[PDB]
Amino acid sequence: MEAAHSKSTEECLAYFGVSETTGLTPDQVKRHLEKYGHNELPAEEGKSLWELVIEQFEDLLVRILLLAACISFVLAWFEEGEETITAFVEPFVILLILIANAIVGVWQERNAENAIEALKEYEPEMGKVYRADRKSVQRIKARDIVPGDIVEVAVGDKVPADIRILSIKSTTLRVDQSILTGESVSVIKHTEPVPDPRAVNQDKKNMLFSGTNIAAGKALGIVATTGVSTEIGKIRDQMAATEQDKTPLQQKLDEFGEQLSKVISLICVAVWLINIGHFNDPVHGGSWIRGAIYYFKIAVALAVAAIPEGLPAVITTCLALGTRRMAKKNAIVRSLPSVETLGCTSVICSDKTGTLTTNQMSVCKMFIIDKVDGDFCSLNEFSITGSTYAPEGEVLKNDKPIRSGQFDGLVELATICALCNDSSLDFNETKGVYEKVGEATETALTTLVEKMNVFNTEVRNLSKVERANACNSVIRQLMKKEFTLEFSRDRKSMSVYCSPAKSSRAAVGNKMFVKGAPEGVIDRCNYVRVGTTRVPMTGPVKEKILSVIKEWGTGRDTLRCLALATRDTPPKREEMVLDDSSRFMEYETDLTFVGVVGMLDPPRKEVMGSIQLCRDAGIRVIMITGDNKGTAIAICRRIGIFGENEEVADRAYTGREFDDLPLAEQREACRRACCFARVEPSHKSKIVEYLQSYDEITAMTGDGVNDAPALKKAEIGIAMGSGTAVAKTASEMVLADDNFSTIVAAVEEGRAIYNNMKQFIRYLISSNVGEVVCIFLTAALGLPEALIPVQLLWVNLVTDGLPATALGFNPPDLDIMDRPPRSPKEPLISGWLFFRYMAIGGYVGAATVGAAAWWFMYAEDGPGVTYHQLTHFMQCTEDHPHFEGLDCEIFEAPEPMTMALSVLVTIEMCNALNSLSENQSLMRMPPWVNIWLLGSICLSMSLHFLILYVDPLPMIFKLKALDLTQWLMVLKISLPVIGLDEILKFIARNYLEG
Ligand SMILES: Nc1ncnc2c1ncn2[C@@H]1O[C@H](COP(=O)(O)OP(=O)(O)O)[C@@H](O)[C@H]1O
Ligand code: ALF
Ligand SMILES: [Ca+2]
Ligand SMILES: [Ca+2]
Ligand SMILES: [K+]
Ligand SMILES: [Mg+2]
Ligand SMILES: [Mg+2]
């Protein structure tokens, strides 16, 4: 606990009784835990109140049905309806379907959040600290850090706790603290005291807040506060939902449901108009109000029917369900649209180092100069065993193990690697493995030096903890590190200014030690070290040096190379201005070349596969990396971006080559090229922008801070679990797995959600069109009514519920990942599908009217009215326009009506079976692909039998239907709807378009 940023570095140190370079003792940590608790926020809890999630009423179309239930509650309250109790059923036939869908949505949401919180909580967040028990920085669960330990944080890192900056290791420290202050651009810090106890966070320029991100630099601090006392910890409970509006496809279907409300309204008012000619008929006693309320009831019931009340839930669900599956593949979705968007992605740009490759770097080859004599130049090459970051392995020259201290050239090589390095190693006592701290490239150097052991230091007798940095530390004693010129990607190198260590001999020379991408560094060398000697750089030498790099980079190990050099006579520090990062390169000139290291960095197993799948899915994959063009192309081949032999001249480019081109041609290069190399963070962004200028959906994959811009710019930003917090922050998705395959899976899933949405819509429209076709085909053709207000509410309850919501659990179509991506601006409803909705809608409307007619005319229990309906309904009371005045009222017979209602349900349930797949056959995609659907259907059929045969019920609705033969008819009329769509799918398949 420390109230102050306004006290000096010293004061804070003294406050906790801590040696700045060593950090807390075990016993100091034991106390501070007890006195302050773990560094975490208890919260973790309650993201939605059981109630909250229930209130996914409030939606577009659900509020309509909600209203509809009130009028039925009020029309019932005035003693009537048409029958007395039949009016108190009405409201529950409407609420029921609503409750059902609500239950499922709520369930899927709860399951999703659980699954997500399982994934997020899985891998523990780690911090880096100096503590007294270990000389080198060590990594602990952030949870364990307490006020008063020395914390190290560098570029990319999430600040783990609220920290008072003690010492800035780079020329600058830049923090992205948007999450706290809203401050959108990164901001500069210093280590000087900020006197005002009052001062706002923005003015605490010597502090670093838990949850912010280091955008540039490296720093050392002492922790002031942790857990709930944390500046961000105080404010959590609060905010008006920095939470959010719905997803593009959600807004699309919403707009589609808005204008389906239009059309249904019209057909509804139309029912009420097309009738009310029947608003004087004997049935409601001819009153000049009664049958206007009745046909108003027919309208409303028809609206509730036609309306897809479950559309808002089924999207919500397919979404939550998509998330739940992504979480099961260890992918964290930070932003809902990510799966649907990724669904129609035509291009996946991707970083290389740590993203496409494993980022488990090992130095396996290195060389220095051996002989230089005129046009002859020769190198001492070396091999290094050990693939891992473990200091165990040996240097080989000519298959024989050497003692690197034998070669002065290697002594300097080791010296630079050690000194020009912001990273180190830590040995995990539990996992029992040597882990990097800071960047892999840099750490590889660290582990290299330990292997080279150039001062023959005695290490056989050291713990695995001590052995980690021993040889490095030895070098650190040999030279004092005045300051460092942080690595920056423009010059593609990094520097370190040093003076000799004891101050034993003042002015025997300061040095700068340099490491960097070989082409730039070698260009800034005028000399070439030969052992302890120096000689002028020359063409033949450069050509030699470079060719062996080309060799290693392009070879079968595809080595990642770094050149190392010393500046023998640096500027005086006084002539050096550190404020301006753009002078660092000139400072790094007049160099002496020492040598080269080549690094092994294997491509991930899963990658080549995923790329193949993208090809098939019509998706492009571009590599975009700061690394050398040689090695980047070599790796593309190894990954399958390029085949092992292809002129690539026209479709791999460096940054320079790319910038050399005119804008027009840059844009076009992006369309054919798959490999961009030696490229800055601005370029990654620009390339993505270019792709986006073909109105395509672009995804960026990456691990590093140099990916954030592109990660942000892209439609979907996918960050590695292993990578930086800043890359993760700029992302919509995070592979905690680091498993590239999930990207493809995620594509497939977004594709499937779309297709599931489609099938739902097809199912409802076509079916509910038939329900409407039906009522208008009677009223026009001039028949007795086929259904009543509650009978309409019944087909609705039982066709528009779980059989529909179920489609959302349809499996992926069989060819889903074999057609190219959908353009995002495609007509939601295809002209051709609109037709298919009508074909089906028409058969359904006609099959249900034809059913009641068949009861009347052809049926043996029905009166034998024979063809021509006997031509009207006029008959009325006893024996009229005497046209076989044989039977009196048979109209109002429940039999014809309950016939139709049973064809409607049965047939609707049939073309749900067509809605397992857009254009696939029940022969290839059978009904048992979706069991959930089949259950729902039984539940409906089941519910529909109940209503018919449990003896109070049929009165509330209508008389039952002769099991044995009437059903055989219902089924005979309804089954063909399947045969119809299945020809219609045959059309769209065996002719094709989309
Ligand atoms: N810490 C460092 N110090 C000096 N040079 C580096 C360092 N890290 C990387 N480099 C060099 O700078 C280049 C640019 O790195 P970057 O832009 O991050 O792309 P990538 O890491 O994928 O190569 C690398 O290819 C490597 O040659
Ligand atoms: F890991 Al890279 F460019 F390939 F930063
Ligand atoms: Ca409905
Ligand atoms: Ca329906
Ligand atoms: K983005
Ligand atoms: Mg990377
Ligand atoms: Mg990198």
- Give the termini distance in whole angstroms: 64 Å
Percent in helix: 40-55%
List the total number of helices: 34
CATH class of the largest domain: Mainly Alpha
Class from helix and strand fractions: alpha+beta
Tally of discrete structural domains: 4
**Largest sheet, if any?**
11 strands, mixed
- The CATH homologous superfamily of the largest domain is termed Calcium-transporting ATPase, transmembrane domain
Shape: elongated
In CATH, the architecture of the largest domain is: Up-down Bundle
- Rg over CA atoms, rounded to whole Å, is 38 Å
Bound molecules: adenosine-5'-diphosphate, tetrafluoroaluminate ion, calcium ion, potassium ion, magnesium ion
How many beta strands in the DSSP annotation? 30
Strand content: 15-25%
CATH topology of the largest domain: Calcium-transporting ATPase, transmembrane domain
Give a description of the structure.
It is a single chain. By secondary structure, the protein is of the alpha+beta class. It has four domains: 1-50 and 121-242, Calcium-transporting ATPase, cytoplasmic transduction domain A (Distorted Sandwich), CATH 2.70.150; 51-120 and 243-345 and 746-994, Calcium-transporting ATPase, transmembrane domain, CATH 1.20.1110.10; 359-602, Calcium-transporting ATPase, cytoplasmic domain N (3-Layer(aba) Sandwich), CATH 3.40.1110.10; 346-358 and 603-745, HAD superfamily/HAD-like (Rossmann fold, 3-Layer(aba) Sandwich). It has 34 helices and 30 strands. The strands form five sheets. Strands 12, 13, 14, 15, 18, 19, 20, 21, 22, 23 and 24 form an eleven-stranded mixed β-sheet that branches. Helix 12 (408-419) runs antiparallel to helix 13, helix 17 (539-554) packs parallel to helix 20 and helix 30 (894-913) runs antiparallel to helix 31. One calcium ion binds next to helix 26 and helix 27. It catalyses: Ca(2+)(in) + ATP + H2O = Ca(2+)(out) + ADP + phosphate + H(+). It is found in: Endoplasmic reticulum membrane; Sarcoplasmic reticulum membrane.
